[PDB]
Scaffold this active site. Sequence first.
Site, mmCIF file in Angstrom:
data_model
loop_
_atom_site.group_PDB
_atom_site.id
_atom_site.type_symbol
_atom_site.label_atom_id
_atom_site.label_comp_id
_atom_site.label_asym_id
_atom_site.label_seq_id
_atom_site.Cartn_x
_atom_site.Cartn_y
_atom_site.Cartn_z
ATOM 1 N N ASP A 154 16.761 37.064 -5.530
ATOM 2 C CA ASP A 154 17.011 38.435 -5.951
ATOM 3 C C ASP A 154 17.908 38.356 -7.170
ATOM 4 O O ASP A 154 18.399 37.273 -7.539
ATOM 5 C CB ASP A 154 17.595 39.312 -4.795
ATOM 6 N N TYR A 179 20.871 38.510 -10.078
ATOM 7 C CA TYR A 179 22.324 38.357 -10.072
ATOM 8 C C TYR A 179 22.965 39.742 -9.761
ATOM 9 O O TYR A 179 22.455 40.795 -10.204
ATOM 10 C CB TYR A 179 22.864 38.015 -11.461
ATOM 11 N N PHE A 214 17.405 34.450 -13.395
ATOM 12 C CA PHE A 214 18.380 33.443 -13.805
ATOM 13 C C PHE A 214 18.966 33.589 -15.184
ATOM 14 O O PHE A 214 19.973 32.925 -15.488
ATOM 15 C CB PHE A 214 17.848 32.028 -13.593
ATOM 16 N N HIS A 216 17.604 27.041 -3.283
ATOM 17 C CA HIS A 216 18.010 27.776 -4.445
ATOM 18 C C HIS A 216 19.102 27.060 -5.235
ATOM 19 O O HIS A 216 19.923 26.337 -4.661
ATOM 20 C CB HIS A 216 18.488 29.163 -3.905
HETATM 21 CL CL LIG Z 1 18.402 37.232 -11.960
#
Ligand SMILES: [Cl-]
Length: 229
Positions: free
Chosen positions: A68, A70, A81, A191
């Site tokens: 999901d 940040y 990311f 992850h």
């Molecule tokens: Cl993200």
Amino acid sequence: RPIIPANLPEDWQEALLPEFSAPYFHELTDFLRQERKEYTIYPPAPDVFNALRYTPLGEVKVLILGQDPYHGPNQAHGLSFSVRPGVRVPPSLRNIYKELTEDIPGFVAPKHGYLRSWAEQGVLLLNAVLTVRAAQANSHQGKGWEHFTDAVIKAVNAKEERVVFILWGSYARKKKKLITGKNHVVIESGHPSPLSEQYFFGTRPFSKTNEALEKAGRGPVEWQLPATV
DNA sequence: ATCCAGTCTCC
DNA sequence: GGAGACATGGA
Ligand SMILES: [Cl-]
């Protein structure tokens, strides 16, 4: 009426029209409107579908799937990311850079975290869930996004030419069963968050991706990012 | 010095 | 899923 995001590539609009028209998506949308009323929700609404905007379905050669977005201020903007020029590189992306430094000879981690140049090469930067409440990881899990990101996975899986799917984390890995195309490749791990990094380091997803692409006559990804953006 | 960035085991 | 154990390297 269908709730169709603006300015999507036509191939995505055609593939995903049934989703934008579906009852579950209407319910997801109504929940997200309430959530935006009562909380700070990331990324900003104009940015939620940016991964599809920056990588058309026809251009996808690698699909990266995180958990999901940040969940801190001015971090997420719809490419999983990535952070904008000027923004501190978050821990997950620091770990991505550490793994790239070991996995791809010559990779030099830049000072920024902006991954647009990967999206422009056919790397779809997705998360399983496309919004999050501030400060609360996976707070929008189980509210309808998973059906929508199943549909995205399914549209990519329907392509004939090899796609490499990189599934980072337990929630992303739930999509594995949908990846049935004979020419596709799945790479899975934990992850890259520091809270799961023992399950991510050493998995060499970047080189494995490039070897798979090359064996299919697709070009490798240039994982090196510009020094400045 | 504290806070803050997932996934495994049992039931 | 729920609860707890074990998860980190920095600002
Ligand atoms: Cl993200």
